[model samples]
Target: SFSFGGFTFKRTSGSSVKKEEEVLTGNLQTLKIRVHEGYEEFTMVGRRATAILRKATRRLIQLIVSGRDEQSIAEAIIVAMVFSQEDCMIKAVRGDLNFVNRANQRLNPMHQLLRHFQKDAKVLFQNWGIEPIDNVMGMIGILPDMTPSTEMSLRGVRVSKM
Candidate 1:
């Protein structure tokens, strides 16, 4: 799906991916592909779910392009932004005037833009038989053992000189 400046994701053989488990590959690359529990859904619930996903679809895909933030990093960062907007909406409902103004973004037409882009991202990952999620091989996870080391556990590489 990952459509950008003539960019698309098609996992050929020997890519940094595995199918046995959905964990990211931290061995020798920049894109690791890890996901966190929160933010994707959220600790604070909103009545409808698609709004948040669509909202995120728009925001996340912006930084995500051939005019983008790396590859996995951009998507992961977008998810983080999703949480930020999610919090904004949640707070707005809670009468947090500060977040109230922020929550009003639901009416934005631009928000739908990213959702379209994200579609390609997802399909590409699936096509590769890899799990596409709101995460980067940067550093994070959802399954058991929340420790950072145990998190992606060499699942996401550390880019020191890249």
Candidate 2:
């Protein structure tokens, strides 16, 4: 039951029932417990700390994209998602557990996640043929480059010699 850009999307009870069935079939009990444990550890230092960090990161991305700096926006997004104030989210992003214990103890897990996320994001962007200064903000959405902000005014700003 939501509308976006004059398009209406409705959530039917059938969908909810199907989702419930999927959850039941997906071993969701274990997932829920793990999530709860992770959240407890993540918030050990206070929830507001992580919340502010996430807010700052999102704002940073918005500012960079608004200024037409797409490359930086992509890097910033990877950093933000990986380093979200939620410890569990970081672990899921890295696909590693070794850093979890240390992250939970020494430093804010969000910060560590941000660093790793940035590294991985760089690799992904490079492999995708995106130029550093290109208007890549659209890459974040399902329909990338479809919106006005993500559309580039020129094709290939510069060419390198072979």
* Best candidate (score: TM-score): 2
Each model's lDDT comes to 0.25, 0.27
For candidate 2, lDDT tens digit of each residue in 1-162? 432112222322222111111111011221111111111111111111111111221121121112124443343334333422332333334244234465445533334445555455433222222223444533322112322323332112221111
lDDT of 1 by residue, 84-158 (tens): 232221212211112135554452321322332344333222221112234455433322121223222211111
Clashing pairs in 1: 1-120, 1-121, 1-124, 2-120, 2-121, 26-155, 32-137, 33-136, 33-137, 34-136
lDDT of 1: 0.25
lDDT of 1 at 92: 20
- Could you tell me every candidate's TM-score relative to the true structure? 0.17, 0.29
Identify the candidate with maximal lDDT: 2
